[PDB]
Design a protein around this ligand. Structure first.
Ligand SMILES: CCCCCN1CC[C@H](COc2ccc([C@@H]3c4ccc(O)cc4CC4(CC4)N3C(=O)c3ccccc3)cc2)C1
Ligand SMILES: CCCCCN1CC[C@H](COc2ccc([C@@H]3c4ccc(O)cc4CC4(CC4)N3C(=O)c3ccccc3)cc2)C1
Lengths: 225, 229
């Protein structure tokens, strides 16, 4: 029943914190820091998801499936967002800013590195707004697992109703921002097509990680508390 | 410079034909049949792509890269469209209609089989229209490789995004013309484009499956087909 304005406010307040790498330097250390960072972010992801309107109306089983499907995409879009104002680099954490030459030493890394950089550049060129980003991240959560699940059918119906609410919210944001109706449709489409690239990166990133992985159902369930 | 009407018309006109498998059936021959089908389908795909407005304005190198990135997605969405009206089955060809249990025979097949059936069900639930379908397939062609490509390349990406914007305009027009409200127009546009994420997912899993068993068309192969005299 939330208005578009209340949807934005709820998503903005739900934003997780920016974490730091374990601090105080080689390729082995680099991979360890990155894995440790992702593991710590995942906990905060779970708390964020529970505050996306409509998420906790789903069964716990379905909440876990959605997180299983979406967690890597969400880590990636968060990385891409905070790397926007840092051309040519990925800001994994405020104390872990890396460029593509630090990715070359690991096989398969630089390919995913450059895809992430290109997404951040696309974000930059589109002047992605924070209100838009949190809508996009919520769409990934709800959309990524919806096609791979009677009760499931209500659950899927519910997920699609929430997704429609986030679409309404994105259009509302673009309207307040002064875009014409044409520019609203075009920008909406542009933002959602980037999500297919984020899915691709998550698939390639998963392949890369299984070449050197996934949070278990039980772990995700436990974090959901 | 096309209108939405001209865009729809050109896309419908460009549609490839529905091809057949060879004329009892055996699971042992299945992958040979499907590989040959896809091979013959790829030829028509090349000539389809050349007729998608704005595609041949790109360099041959970029045309190849787009097709390299999108060919399996395009085969899959064609499959899903052909199967839409056959619940529980995948209509690879009119004479090659398979169900889930026939996918069991090969390792890792049924997982992808089920994802394709779920996409078919989603198409069916949305009552996807043929005019919407051809727009979606053209978006796949132009979008899937554009983030993995220099002044020429900047010019190419701007062109690709302008053509994608035109297709977006065309999708909205179709929905407006069919009487949907603006709220319903935006909502359906989003619903359609989010399916493309699942199609990308399916393509990556299928690409893994194909390597698990000459797996992709090569650059030079795609370029020979694309680079006509
Ligand atoms: C112990 C119980 C369950 C254990 C599960 N975890 C234990 C292994 C499981 C690690 O998955 C991970 C491991 C590492 C990354 C980093 C990471 C970290 C933070 C970020 O915000 C974003 C990213 C982005 C990225 C792409 C994905 N990544 C990389 O390095 C990278 C970047 C560029 C090019 C190639 C690679 C993410 C996910 C999760
Ligand atoms: C000389 C270099 C070779 C260049 C051409 N290659 C020739 C071998 C290289 C084979 O790719 C192929 C081979 C086979 C398929 C079928 C096929 C055929 C037609 C269709 O419309 C759609 C599909 C869909 C699907 C998923 C992909 N497929 C499968 O079986 C399948 C279906 C369900 C679950 C698991 C698997 C497509 C593509 C491509």
């Amino acid at each position: 029943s939330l208005t578009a304005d209340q949807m934005v406010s709820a998503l903005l307040d739900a934003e997780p914190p920016i974490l730091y790498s374990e601090y105080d330097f080689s390729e082995a250390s680099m991979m360890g820091l990155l894995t440790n960072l992702a593991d710590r972010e995942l906990v905060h992801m779970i708390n964020w998801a529970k505050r996306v309107p409509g998420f906790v109306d789903l069964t716990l089983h379905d909440q876990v499936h959605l997180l299983e499907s979406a967690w890597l995409e969400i880590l990636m879009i968060g990385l891409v967002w905070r790397s926007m104002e840092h051309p040519g680099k990925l800001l994994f954490a405020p104390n872990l800013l890396l460029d593509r030459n630090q990715g070359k030493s690991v096989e398969g890394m630089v390919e995913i590195f450059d895809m992430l950089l290109a997404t951040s550049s696309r974000f930059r060129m589109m002047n992605l707004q924070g209100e838009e980003f949190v809508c996009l991240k919520s769409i990934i959560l709800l959309n990524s697992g919806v096609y791979t699940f009677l009760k499931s059918l209500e659950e899927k119906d519910h997920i699609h109703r929430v997704l429609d609410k986030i679409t309404d919210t994105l259009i509302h944001l673009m309207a307040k921002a002064g875009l014409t109706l044409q520019q609203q449709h075009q920008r909406l489409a542009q933002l959602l097509l980037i999500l297919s690239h984020i899915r691709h990166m998550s698939n390639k990133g998963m392949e890369h990680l299984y070449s050197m992985v996934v949070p278990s159902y039980d772990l995700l369930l436990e974090m959901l508390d």
